[PDB]
Amino acid sequence: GSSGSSGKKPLVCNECGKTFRQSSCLSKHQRIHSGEKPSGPSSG
């Protein structure tokens, strides 16, 4: 009875490694590591 194993991957901060439940949560948290938005040759 294979469930499916399609996806449904959790949302974790690739910066620290903290998993979250909501999408806005993780993101609103990532801002802590990443300052302004990625413009270009400025940040990276």
Binding residues for Zn ion (CB under 5 A): 13, 15-16
Give me the least distance between CB of 23 and Zn ion, in Å please.
14
Give me the least distance between CB of 28 and Zn ion, in Å please.
11
Detail the DSSP E strand segments found in 1-44. Answer: 11-12, 19-20
Minimum CB distance to Zn ion smaller for 6 or for 20: 20
Query: Are 13 and 21 within 8 A, CB to CB?
Result: no
Q: How far apart are CA 18 and CA 37, in angstroms?
A: 21
Give me the least distance between CB of 30 and Zn ion, in Å please.
6
